[PDB]
């Protein structure tokens, strides 16, 4: 039977089922107001699917100038052709190589660069914001969105909506590595995941993505819709209450010290945004400090809300094509403001 709503997480995580549902507002609301994240699956069924594919984005963009990161080292490559990230992220044997000669697990940077996502691909633009999900709160003029309402008083997010592009991570080792590391934002996002990869050539790697899942701390209804195998996983997410994020700095300057960092006693470890917290680091955050996170397997066609002033990171399972849009609703609000 088709359902409004079920549970993630043992029960901490809202998952709504239809994004089109005009009464979600009633169940979202409640859990938003208690600082937790949110899941709407579903997303995908809405898209027009052949706007959201890698060959399209590289036979229209191909020629601009872009950098990559290598997500293993954090190296730059600097000043090559989109084209370049885009024609490997399927097919293994077309990636760029680092010295050993392994293909690399790279990520694209800033593309669409700045707030030019409206300008470059304006149907993109239309098939994604006629469709995000909760639309009072994720419009740019939603009732409940206050971005365009507030005075300087305020941190106000760019235009929108940002693309985050990038292929999997592959070995054991690649467990402990992020593909965005640990940070947090003064506005509230919808990141909405478009298209995954789950490809060859070195492909039969599903073995190490369930001990990523299980190691990662994934709950057994998660568990249960990773083994189902009707729905394609993209990305692991870990995320943690706004009200956490001074023990997860205290966490972080203690790891720092032992690493021998040399660090001033006041330094912010999560607006460095150079941490991954791994399974070593997940355990001592709750053993040594009390705090517990939210672990979100986002799947294609999953919208995942981040609350304002939430620590958050992301380590991609397979090729992922995510697009997110900031605002602001009234419920934290206290976090972009500039006083006390
Ligand atoms: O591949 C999976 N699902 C899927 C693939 C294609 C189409 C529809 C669904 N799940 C999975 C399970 C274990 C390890 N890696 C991935
Ligand atoms: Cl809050
Ligand atoms: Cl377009
Ligand atoms: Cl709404
Ligand atoms: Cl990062
Ligand atoms: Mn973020």
Same mark, same amino acid.
């Given at each position: 039977?088709?359902?409004?709503?079920?549970?993630?997480?043992?029960?901490?995580?809202?998952?709504?089922?239809?994004?089109?549902?005009?009464?979600?507002?009633?169940?979202?609301?409640?859990?938003?107001?208690?600082?937790?994240?949110?899941?709407?699956?579903?997303?995908?069924?809405?898209?027009?699917?052949?706007?959201?594919?890698?060959?399209?984005?590289?036979?229209?963009?191909?020629?601009?100038?872009?950098?990559?990161?290598?997500?293993?080292?954090?190296?730059?490559?600097?000043?090559? $052709?989109?084209? %370049?990230?885009? /024609?490997?992220? #399927?097919?293994?044997?077309? =990636?760029?190589?680092?010295?050993?000669?392994? &293909?690399?697990?790279?990520?694209?940077?800033?593309?669409?660069?700045?707030?030019?996502?409206?300008?470059?691909?304006?149907?993109?633009?239309?098939?994604?914001?006629?469709?995000?999900?909760?639309?009072?709160?994720?419009?740019?003029?939603?009732?409940?969105?206050?971005?365009?309402?507030?005075?300087?008083?305020?941190?106000?997010?760019?235009?929108?909506?940002?693309?985050?592009?990038?292929?999997?991570?592959?070995?054991?080792?690649?467990?402990?590595?992020?593909?965005?590391?640990?940070?947090?934002?003064?506005?509230?996002?919808?990141?909405?995941?478009?298209?995954?990869?789950?490809?060859?050539?070195?492909?039969?790697?599903?073995?190490?993505?369930? $001990?990523?899942? %299980?190691?990662? /701390?994934?709950? #057994?209804?998660?568990?249960? =819709?990773?083994?189902?195998?009707?729905?394609? &996983?993209?990305?692991?997410?870990?995320?943690?209450?706004?009200?956490?994020?001074?023990?997860?700095?205290?966490?972080?300057?203690?790891?720092?010290?032992?690493?021998?960092?040399?660090?001033?006693?006041?330094?912010?470890?999560?607006?460095?945004?150079?941490?991954?917290?791994?399974?070593?680091?997940?355990?001592?955050?709750?053993?040594?400090?009390?705090?517990?996170?939210?672990?979100?397997?986002?799947?294609?066609?999953?919208?995942?809300?981040?609350?304002?002033?939430?620590?958050?990171?992301?380590?991609?399972?397979?090729?992922?094509?995510?697009?997110?849009?900031?605002?602001?609703?009234?419920?934290?609000?206290?976090?972009?403001?500039?006083?006390?």
């Amino acid at each position: 039977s088709m359902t409004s709503h079920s549970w993630l997480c043992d029960g901490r995580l809202l998952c709504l089922h239809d994004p089109s549902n005009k009464n979600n507002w009633k169940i979202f609301r409640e859990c938003w107001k208690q600082g937790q994240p949110v899941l709407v699956s579903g997303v995908h069924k809405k898209l027009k699917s052949e706007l959201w594919k890698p060959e399209a984005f590289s036979q229209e963009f191909g020629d601009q100038d872009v950098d990559l990161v290598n997500c293993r080292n954090c190296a730059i490559i600097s000043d090559v $052709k989109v084209r %370049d990230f885009w /024609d490997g992220f #399927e097919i293994i044997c077309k =990636r760029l190589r680092s010295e050993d000669g392994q &293909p690399m697990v790279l990520k694209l940077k800033d593309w669409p660069p700045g707030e030019d996502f409206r300008d470059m691909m304006p149907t993109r633009f239309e098939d994604l914001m006629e469709n995000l999900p909760l639309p009072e709160y994720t419009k740019r003029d939603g009732r409940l969105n206050l971005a365009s309402r507030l005075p300087s008083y305020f941190v106000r997010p760019d235009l929108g909506p940002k693309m985050y592009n990038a292929y999997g991570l592959i070995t054991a080792e690649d467990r402990r590595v992020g593909t965005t590391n640990l940070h947090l934002d003064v506005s509230d996002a919808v990141n909405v995941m478009v298209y995954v990869g789950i490809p060859i050539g070195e492909g039969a790697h599903d073995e190490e993505v369930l $001990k990523t899942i %299980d190691e990662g /701390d994934a709950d #057994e209804v998660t568990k249960e =819709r990773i083994h189902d195998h009707k729905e394609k &996983p993209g990305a692991l997410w870990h995320i943690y209450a706004a009200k956490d994020a001074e023990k997860i700095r205290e966490l972080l300057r203690k790891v720092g010290e032992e690493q021998g960092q040399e660090n001033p006693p006041d330094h912010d470890p999560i607006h460095d945004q150079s941490w991954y917290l791994d399974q070593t680091l997940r355990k001592r955050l709750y053993e040594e400090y009390g705090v517990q996170g939210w672990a979100i397997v986002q799947f294609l066609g999953d919208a995942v809300f981040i609350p304002a002033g939430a620590p958050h990171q992301v380590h991609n399972l397979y090729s992922c094509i995510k697009v997110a849009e900031d605002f602001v609703s009234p419920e934290h609000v206290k976090h972009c403001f500039r006083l006390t």
